[PDB]
Design a protein around this ligand. Structure first.
Ligand SMILES: *[C@H](C(=O)O)[C@H](O)C(=O)N[C@@H](CC(C)C)C(=O)NCCCCNC(N)=[NH2+]
Length: 249
């Protein structure tokens, strides 16, 4: 396994799902029975958008979006009146990567906060985000499509599924991305739920550096069969693993 220091850390990239990332997500309209309450608050960006946006920032790409996206929230989503149609004008976007900062801590200009929230909302919409207090997406299958179709990333972008590969071939694919300075979109499921995140380094001892998309909480090195961040307190993201690799302009 090669030694690759955290690619996101190298560029100071640390995103999360709340303020100011979520300034343009849909504003919650309704109460889910027994959950008081989130009305009038912006929905979370969703871990899938946060992971994807961090990788996009690593590349500062694209300057210009390619294709718009529209979808309708599931009729089972309790937070919005139905139908709820969302639209991202991605084909018209001129993303100013100078204004989309690698992290946000509070003194950023309105231009800079608009820049990141626009990216987060565009990415979220492109992956059919089921917006809520927390926001869920199918993940890899949506991410690979959005990156190519809407964002104009290389045709090389594709989803890989863990059970489609031997252990050696799986790790070889992740390693190759990291040797090419290409952070990997990754997701898995356990006891605790399913979560998406970024693999962006390797220690040469078969641990991989993970950015969990929680602004830095639990970020560090993990074995792929033990993606068990401290925030779980609680079986980690070790089942139904998939990644999106080949992520480059
Ligand atoms: C992201 C987060 O903020 O933590 C969240 O974990 C997430 O998106 N999880 C995915 C699981 C994958 C491993 C990414 C998830 O739970 N998806 C459920 C599918 C979409 C939800 N429902 C509908 N109708 N779209």
């Amino acid at each position: 396994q090669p030694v690759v220091k955290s690619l996101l850390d190298s560029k100071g990239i640390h995103y999360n799902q709340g303020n100011p990332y979520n300034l343009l997500t849909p504003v919650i309209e309704k109460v889910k029975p027994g959950e008081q309450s989130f009305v009038g608050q912006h929905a979370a960006t969703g871990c899938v958008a946060t992971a994807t946006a961090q990788i996009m920032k690593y590349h500062n790409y694209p300057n210009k979006g390619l294709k718009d996206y529209t979808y309708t929230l599931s009729s089972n989503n309790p937070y919005f009146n139905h139908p709820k149609n969302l639209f991202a004008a991605i084909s018209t976007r001129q993303y100013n990567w100078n204004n989309i900062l690698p992290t946000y801590s509070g003194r950023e200009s309105n231009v800079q906060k608009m820049a990141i929230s626009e990216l987060m909302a565009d990415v979220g919409i492109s992956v059919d985000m089921d917006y809520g207090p927390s926001s869920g997406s199918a993940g890899s299958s949506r991410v690979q499509r959005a990156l190519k179709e809407n964002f104009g990333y290389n045709q090389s972008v594709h989803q890989i599924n863990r059970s489609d590969f031997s252990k050696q071939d799986w790790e070889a694919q992740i390693d190759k991305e990291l040797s090419q300075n290409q952070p990997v979109y990754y997701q898995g499921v356990g006891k605790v739920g399913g979560h998406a995140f970024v693999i962006d380094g390797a220690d040469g001892r078969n641990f991989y550096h993970v950015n969990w998309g929680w602004g830095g909480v639990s970020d560090g090195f993990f074995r792929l069969d033990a993606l068990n961040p401290s925030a779980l307190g609680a079986g980690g993201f070790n089942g139904y693993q998939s990644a999106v690799v080949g992520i480059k302009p």
